[PDB]
Design a protein around this ligand. Sequence first.
Ligand SMILES: O=C(O)CCCC[C@@H]1SC[C@@H]2NC(=O)N[C@@H]21
Ligand SMILES: O=C(O)CCCC[C@@H]1SC[C@@H]2NC(=O)N[C@@H]21
Ligand SMILES: O=C(O)CCCC[C@@H]1SC[C@@H]2NC(=O)N[C@@H]21
Ligand SMILES: O=C(O)CCCC[C@@H]1SC[C@@H]2NC(=O)N[C@@H]21
Lengths: 123, 121, 123, 121
Amino acid sequence: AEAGITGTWYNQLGSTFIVTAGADGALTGTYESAVGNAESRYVLTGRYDSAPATDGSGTALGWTVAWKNNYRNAHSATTWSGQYVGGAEARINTQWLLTSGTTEANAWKSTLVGHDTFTKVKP
Amino acid sequence: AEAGITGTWYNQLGSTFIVTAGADGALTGTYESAVGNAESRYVLTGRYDSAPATDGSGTALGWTVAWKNNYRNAHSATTWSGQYVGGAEARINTQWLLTSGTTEANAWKSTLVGHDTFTKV
Amino acid sequence: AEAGITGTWYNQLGSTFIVTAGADGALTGTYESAVGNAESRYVLTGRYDSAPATDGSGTALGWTVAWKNNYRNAHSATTWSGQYVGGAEARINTQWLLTSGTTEANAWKSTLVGHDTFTKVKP
Amino acid sequence: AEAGITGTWYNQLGSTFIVTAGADGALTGTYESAVGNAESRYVLTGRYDSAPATDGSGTALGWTVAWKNNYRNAHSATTWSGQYVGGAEARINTQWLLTSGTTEANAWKSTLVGHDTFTKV
Ligand SMILES: O=C(O)CCCC[C@@H]1SC[C@@H]2NC(=O)N[C@@H]21
Ligand SMILES: O=C(O)CCCC[C@@H]1SC[C@@H]2NC(=O)N[C@@H]21
Ligand SMILES: O=C(O)CCCC[C@@H]1SC[C@@H]2NC(=O)N[C@@H]21
Ligand SMILES: O=C(O)CCCC[C@@H]1SC[C@@H]2NC(=O)N[C@@H]21
């Protein structure tokens, strides 16, 4: 649900995710990573599927971060795809793809794959 | 580097991707899939890394589509991560993750992975 | 190391992995899954990279299971790619790809991706 | 279904895959990669699901290569998961995972994902 998703979240690496979910299925915010060629905050945009099902199914969603801001430019972008599971201990479980810009010759090694679990800090 | 990302692209399944790239890294537009539990257009939002880097590399980017619109709601979302290579034949080469909302019991099989190549042809 | 890998392992879903690592970099055994279109044991074969590094790096390895035996035929195969981290609480952390045989038309939805963590039962 | 899997296949990077399929689901052979920290041949072992199923589907299979031989040891392993489609032009369409051994600190970036298509041409 938008209200359930809106908030501050942290994952197992110690990275920060601040997001706002709008009535139209939109997600906007900033992300701070604890690892990598990154520093300060980066803007993020995504979408969430606003009418889930009733039942004890998760809400599917996804968002993107291009790793460029006023301080660093890493020439990469990461996308996270997953589901939001609410309750008293709400979580967002995801799998992600991190693509770096390469020459055609090294494109075979341009994408890393992983998984992150986020915990909401409420309050 | 960045540049002719704006436009109408098509992939090997016959899907249509219409996007506008803003000067500060944002991507907005609509997507229509030729397959799956989907019909008509859906809203997409993403980001690209303008630099990009001299050693003729691609420009990294990504975007998301939540499969809900006024015709269907498939309770899923797809994210595409890849890079744009411009030139005579411009291409956007991606890998995607399609997650459906499931119950805990079925969470082990909630995500499909695949790859799509887009051209303006 | 071969001795460190050889044994019985279980993952978060409650599935069983029995393996033997040979001196030549080989892995052979049986796998029993707690979920899916599966029943009884299935044969597995894989390889492990025998001379890791000294250091506190993991040993990379991978194995495959075709889901066909005398009782069921699911027309699928799963491959697990990951690393073995030994110590007192040894673990094998992986990401997997499960491909089902399809017609050309539905090949776009033939592969599922996930991650499993295995814990060794010693003794 | 299964059948002409045995043989010498090549993918879009120019790598060579030589395999033998046994009648009870086993796959054995050698692999030579045209890219990366690798040279000469490496041992591979895998499995395929013989049934396969009537609705002209592919045969599911997978195999593993640990990148260590008498010339190099790259401390990594790759697994390919996909399906074989025979016929006039037979193809093995796969997605792979390449994991390198890292320390805990770098475990978040230990795995690359990609896709390869093999032909006997
Ligand atoms: O190094 C880069 O290219 C930019 C930083 C990438 C950080 C990644 S995104 C996935 C994983 N989850 C995190 O919170 N950080 C790393
Ligand atoms: O069935 C669904 O869940 C919604 C439609 C999904 C269509 C997918 S997204 C990845 C692949 N590329 C496309 O153009 N369409 C399919
Ligand atoms: O349903 C099938 O096609 C065969 C069973 C698949 C079981 C999978 S493999 C990955 C995940 N890990 C497990 O232990 N079980 C599921
Ligand atoms: O550099 C390494 O770690 C060892 C060589 C890896 C070569 C990879 S495996 C997937 C892709 N397909 C190939 O034919 N070669 C590359």
